[PDB]
Symmetry: C2
Subunit: 437 residues, 2 copies
């Protein structure tokens, strides 16, 4: 063939440099980088720089960056689908894993691999059909992903005897396998009456991962091409955001005992199922729709100002606004607004107009009110409304979509954990009596 290197080969090429870097860092093992206070122990380790995460670093001025690249750089450089304006999550995965921007051709081949591996074993379909209708969607998703450990090459290879230096390779194979399957699993959660059909439907192997996901959700075809772009963008933007969030961290933690990627990301998803991790986009949507109900579709800047002041004076927060460290709007938020800017039907939607207006007014109001640090919009300010605009109006399932995206980054780090030989995560506990002394 006329073939450029595949993803596994591209990864293999950059492993030696990273192992060398690791070796150099290890020579500085004894260097002090912070202090531990009582506050860190009782406060969930907040502020405590205590884990490794390679692919993403939060810049206080530019927001989240992937191997030093801004969201804007990624939108410019990362390949797109066969039609459409937005970066592909598969391309983002390539970047996160290798540190490099793939060619369009490399991405096409990776997309085909993902489409070919998207089928599910019969027992997974049977398992999903056993679930009561009322079982929470994130419980369903977590369980089904764990159940896919029957397909784990890492689990079997480890049991048979496998050298430490090769742990990464079956870890990589399982990660690609999970990535390929998880959209289909998510669609079965979305469409519980149609497991037999959705569970076995053949996918166009020349289409991208997001397109195929959209098809399994019942939104395929050329008439849904804007949604395809939204979904690509969403899945790419939410893929990774450092190691400290619960889903990323839990995946690393369970993986560090050498549980395979299916078991490990299932733990991640159980964390994402927590109300303090997975509900932000839902909260914003509800808040926006309630604001629209009160002030209408025709309102002044003063009406918006007044609504914000009323909310704050009543002791309530504006969701989707505020950060501990980031001093500007979340660049993931701006990318969603950039997506919207070229679509007139979105710009005409009053609910989207309200998101935009709020983004132009709320920061100054919140600043003046003085209780919220760095009161700029985050990505959750816009994601829910855009899904809602395209007819995805069951907010309960927005965490499921988040779960699909959030496979990307943690799986990348799990592969690097195994490439480098990182050990079991094992902090030390202490009781309250021991802190009193």
């Amino acid at each position: 063939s006329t073939a450029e290197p595949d993803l596994k080969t591209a990864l293999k090429a950059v492993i030696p440099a990273k192992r060398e870097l690791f070796k150099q860092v290890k020579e500085r093992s004894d260097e002090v980088i912070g202090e531990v206070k009582v506050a860190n122990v009782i406060g969930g380790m907040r502020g405590l720089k205590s884990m490794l995460w390679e692919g993403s670093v939060l810049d206080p001025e530019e927001g989240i960056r992937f191997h030093g690249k801004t969201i804007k750089d990624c939108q410019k450089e990362l390949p797109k689908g066969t039609s459409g304006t937005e970066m592909l999550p598969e391309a983002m995965f390539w970047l996160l894993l290798t540190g490099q921007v793939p060619s369009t051709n490399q991405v096409r081949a990776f997309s085909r691999e993902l489409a070919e591996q998207s089928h599910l074993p019969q027992h997974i379909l049977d398992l999903i059909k056993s679930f009561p209708r009322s079982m929470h969607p994130m419980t369903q998703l977590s369980i089904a992903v764990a159940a896919l450990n029957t397909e784990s090459k890492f689990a079997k290879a480890y049991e048979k005897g496998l050298s430490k230096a090769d742990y990464w390779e079956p870890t990589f194979d399982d990660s690609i396998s999970l990535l390929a399957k998880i959209p289909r699993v998510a669609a079965l959660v979305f469409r519980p009456d149609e497991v037999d059909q959705v569970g076995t439907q053949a996918l166009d192997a020349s289409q991208d991962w997001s397109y195929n996901f959209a098809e399994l959700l019942g939104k395929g075809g050329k008439e849904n091409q804007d949604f395809h772009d939204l979904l690509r963008l969403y899945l790419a933007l939410h893929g990774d955001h450092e190691g400290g969030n619960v889903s990323a961290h839990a995946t690393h933690l369970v993986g560090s005992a050498l549980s395979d990627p299916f078991l490990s990301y299932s733990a991640g998803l159980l964390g994402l199922a927590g109300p303090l991790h997975g509900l932000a986009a839902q909260e914003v949507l509800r808040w926006i729709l309630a604001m629209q109900d009160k002030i209408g579709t025709k309102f002044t800047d003063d009406d918006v100002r007044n609504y914000l002041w009323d909310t704050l004076k009543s002791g309530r927060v504006v969701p989707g606004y505020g950060h501990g460290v980031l001093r500007k709007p979340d660049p993931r938020f701006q990318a969603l607004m950039d997506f919207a800017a070229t679509r007139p039907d979105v710009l005409a939607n009053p609910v989207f107009q309200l998101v935009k207006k709020n983004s132009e007014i709320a920061p100054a109001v919140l600043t003046e009110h003085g209780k919220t640090k760095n009161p700029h919009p985050n990505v959750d300010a816009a994601s829910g409304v855009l899904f809602y605009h395209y007819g995805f109006q069951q907010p309960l399932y927005y965490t499921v979509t988040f779960g699909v995206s959030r496979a990307l980054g943690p799986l990348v780090q799990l592969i690097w954990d195994r490439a480098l030989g990182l050990p079991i995560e094992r902090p030390k506990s202490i009781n309250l009596l021991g802190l009193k002394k």
Copy 2:
């Protein structure tokens, strides 16, 4: 004048713990250690960075529960209506309340556990969907997560529930999970008998371990020694600080306010990892291979020689060695104490091999010089004792560990919610960021 039940006993000690927490919180700004590069790249090892109330490792005396040694627990904790060993239910009471329950209080708690052990139909259907070859720890993890359909915490949180009451539905879910998990484990053990084992009624006058044994097909007076072993095992492995992966993962997922079913499922997924849940199996295999080489009648010298040969060949002695503990694990000694009163165990050459090794390997390992604190841990003896009683599928030993290890993490999850502990959220960094 009926004695307080477990929920009431817990409620009585909450105010004192919230007061203690408040005092500690005033010293929030106090420095207690440093973070080094080594801690970041080394999985936070040695870094005192999380809260765990019920258990603290003493470098001389081993794990202590509210200050009590294993030996103290064996003396003070109530026992079953027959048998010599402490009950895991009693250990749970201690872990949770800080107090030793009366025999009467434990009997009533055991009755509650028996009565709450039944499973909804959809859980049975779910377990029947599993392929026969699905790994037992995958089965156990999934089934425990699936029980979140029964979560009072999840429903109460959704409805609107005040922070100050988070602990109560957390407690109810924890008792519910504890009552059900033996039965779930037995369904994993006995996949051809889901309908029968899944609905069988439990004797509400018997203890949790006895009833677990019954569901495994080892009930009745002929298996009474096994009942004692199982009680002891389940009690010993319940809790061992917050840093182990199953305890920590349960705390971590719980800290996002996922309920106890989802949270302990994450714990179990961690216990499924080869570096966390396989030690007992590894020791058993190593002991049987030693028996194969040196035979059923062996001398002290034979054992010494076998150990030297193993080490000189570059292989390790599993079940020996610790980073901080300077003596034999007291959980190991408790298993040996159990064995000491049973002549059929003492006559088993496989057990004799465990014992001989425990008397000889430390000096050999010390002399060889590669192994820090080369004393036996609990894993040195647990496998062989199960094996002696006819529990000879080592693949399922992690399942039994999973049942035990519900105890401690669920306790801490209740306290996490009682105190209002926040989401666990460390900060990450890349290698380039440490290198500059």
